[PDB]
Symmetry: C2
Subunit: 362 residues, 2 copies
């Protein structure tokens, strides 16, 4: 796609700015400059650019219905691309760290960054921090004189905080809350009492939906100066809903999508994650299916994983999925219709974000 | 000290604000709220509060020479305390991550946060991210209407970036630069060619001096609205110098200060760090001392560490230290004298920052 290529060309412009500044102001040597260029490419590139292109999309919609000079148009699109990369970089940050936390092997068809031989965990932790730090650097550089600066920084930060909180809910999702204590080593849950739709929903809300949908959508709004022309509560609701769905697909794919197609190797069963599979399964299983799940979940033994996977196929979960989706389709279209009242153009953009999410195969 | 107690009472006010907001806006449960309260206390408290009290100090100086209402005075001091905690929290962030990276066991007389049984590395990585994220949260809350907001955020960010860059120079300080490559596992240096005063100085400049001295000093200036009444290049120079010295002491203590007094267990020899000890030693050793250093450095074997430590004692390094210090004393006092031209009050505060650093025993 031509538009994707234009968004990538701003990546080259950002990277070259970031690296020239390391050299001219942070006394970097060529090899450390090289390491961070490979780090940026391996961690920030190779994905779908969903979040980034979302901001471009939202901006493009408002441009098509609003009077601007040619140069202003080019500036808005360039801002949209820069904000998109802020988000793509903030995601790169969370991915680097999350891949350590989850004990993952593969990401975007390559070894997880921390698994690169010349990286290791200890460098990758700090490489992760650099990625987020790059987001603020590129913000202050690119947007210093922009009227939306304060708004964008305050939002960005809030979204970032929420992701980090969400990551905490996620990584402690297999511990009984009552047992959670920094001083005592957490034994995994035996009851699974906390594998509920309500609790699963709090996890995903925080760890996913803010950075994945809210941020890109509001960001495209800021760069167009169009945030006053929308009902913000609707934008928030639609973002959390679509974002939720996106995570359900992600959870399904962990288990049932071949790594050749996913570009990652699944670990939720092994990690004992509070995933949609586990929660939907515990929501319909009989007493003996539950007991067999309990005897096998959260263990790296390939034979126990196999048992958990066989349990999922048997429990006919893609019927629960089809209902779940049918329901999400209802509420999303409903929100889209509600969005048309103040902002038909924005509503279109949400329809396009939803079409692409709904249709994704990786 | 009474002043320290007043600064801590703002910590209780910040913590209670942070935790009430987790509950009322992020749907936290009491036990996860409890975990993060212990996390904040264990990671943010128990230190010297040097960086935090520095901002209080700088503000206190300007207050003593400037006309303000009582309420304004109380607001400035409260801002100074909030900015101080931003920095203490940003340090807590770097410490949590750094302790993972360095394979450290003890910090402030307690197991390193990641070594708490109910923590582990994977939670501590994300606990670290939360700590930094808390800094921006408390900034936007406490300072939303303050004229210095943009200035403080832009500085903060720059200082944060520099720390992360510095951490990269530090953690890759035992690799030959030419060999550095994400795809190939780094073999430690055999030549030590890069253990130079110049290179050691670039490391410390970035990883230490910005967050440790520049940030607290400029921050106290911002909260007093007094940044126009100083020569900024002098503040920068004094900060990098004192900051450097501070890191030299830190490096000396790693090796020669009993963990009972340090509150940490040293790892630089084992980690093969480009420390002042190693660099000063390579700067004076004879051919056979160098060879014995090469055969023993960067290895966890207690007997090889012993050999490196014996080499340090023999090479009479506390003579090099005494010269190094005598020199730093010259240049610091020189800068202090230069600072008196525009800002005698600020110059006093720097003298007090220096006296306390110079005199520290942990
Ligand atoms: O399947 P992955 O590992 O790509 C994941 O979606 C990443 N991820 C998602 C949300 C927040 C985050 F920091 C990271 P998950 O949550 O680990 O399943
Ligand atoms: O002796 P430590 O481990 O307290 C140290 O001073 C921490 N520290 C210092 C500077 C930056 C940083 F992120 C962390 P060092 O550098 O590991 O020696
Ligand atoms: C489910 C989430 C939020 C993490 C994976 O994100 P994506 O699947 O969008 O990642 P890339 O295409 O960017 O790899
Ligand atoms: C040398 C540096 C910068 C890290 C240790 O910092 P401090 O020795 O000031 O840490 P605390 O008193 O805050 O533990
Ligand atoms: Mg993951
Ligand atoms: Mg994860
Ligand atoms: Mg997943
Ligand atoms: Mg350390
Ligand atoms: Mg260190
Ligand atoms: Mg040290």
């Amino acid at each position: 796609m031509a538009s994707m290529e234009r968004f990538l060309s701003v990546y080259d412009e950002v990277q070259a700015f970031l690296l020239d500044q390391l050299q001219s102001k942070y006394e970097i040597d060529p090899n450390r400059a090289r390491y961070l260029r490979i780090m940026m490419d391996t961690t920030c590139l190779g994905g779908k650019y969903f979040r980034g292109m979302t901001v471009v999309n939202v901006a493009e919609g408002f441009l098509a219905v609003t009077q601007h000079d040619e140069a202003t148009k080019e500036r808005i699109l360039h801002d949209a691309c820069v904000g998109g990369w802020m988000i793509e970089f903030l995601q790169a940050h969370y991915l680097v760290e999350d891949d350590i936390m989850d004990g993952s092997v593969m990401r975007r068809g390559k070894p997880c960054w921390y698994r690169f031989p010349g990286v290791t965990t200890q460098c990758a932790i700090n490489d992760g921090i650099i990625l987020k730090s790059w987001t603020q650097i590129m913000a202050w550089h690119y947007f210093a004189d922009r009227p939306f600066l304060k708004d964008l920084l305050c939002l960005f930060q809030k979204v970032d905080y929420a992701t980090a909180v969400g990551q905490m809910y996620d990584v402690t999702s297999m511990c009984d809350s009552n047992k959670l204590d920094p001083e005592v080593a957490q034994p995994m849950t035996t009851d699974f009492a906390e594998f509920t739709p309500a609790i699963y929903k709090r996890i995903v809300k925080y760890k996913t939906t803010f950075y994945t949908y809210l941020l890109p959508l509001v960001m495209g709004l800021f760069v167009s100066e169009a945030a006053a022309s929308v009902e913000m509560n609707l934008v928030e609701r639609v973002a959390h809903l679509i974002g939720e769905y996106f995570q359900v697909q992600d959870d399904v794919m962990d288990c049932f999508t071949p790594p050749e197609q996913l570009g990652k190797v699944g670990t939720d069963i092994e990690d004992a994650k509070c995933s949609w599979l586990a929660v939907t399964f515990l929501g319909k299983a009989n007493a003996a299916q539950v007991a067999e799940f309990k005897a096998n979940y959260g263990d790296k033994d390939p034979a126990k994983v196999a048992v958990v996977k066989r349990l999922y196929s048997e429990a006919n979960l893609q019927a629960d999925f089809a209902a779940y989706e049918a329901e999400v389709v209802r509420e999303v279209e409903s929100l889209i219709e509600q969005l048309k009242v103040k902002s038909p153009t924005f509503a279109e953009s949400v329809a396009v974000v939803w079409e692409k999410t709904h249709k994704r195969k990786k």
